[PDB]
Amino acid sequence: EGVFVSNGTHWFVTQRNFYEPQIITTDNTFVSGNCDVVIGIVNNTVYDPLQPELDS
């Protein structure tokens, strides 16, 4: 529920009608397929909120 957006170096997800940038995460994004198909896809990390808890 947003757009992917960049300040020039970092990538954020934003609500579409008001600038409020959030860290790109498994929970504000969804997967479909692989990078071969989409015209203009970009390489950036996506954060997983389970992992730093499971690393405890």
């Binding site: 757009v3 579409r16 969804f30 479909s32 397929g33 198909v37 989409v38 015209i39 203009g40």
Partner: protein, 49 residues
């Protein structure tokens, strides 16, 4: 407010209850179907006064 046209059509797809990956994964087919459908407008008006 500018937005890339393929991203505008991805919003138009959410607005009809189709998930936006359906457009990005079918984008060239959707553009071909659109360009073909505009071509039929020329033919219909260039014949059916």
């Amino acid at each position: 407010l500018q937005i890339p046209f393929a991203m505008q059509m991805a919003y138009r797809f959410n607005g009809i209850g189709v998930t936006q990956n359906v457009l990005y994964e079918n984008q060239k087919l959707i553009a071909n179907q659109f360009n073909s459908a505009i071509g039929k407008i020329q033919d219909s008006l260039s014949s059916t006064a």
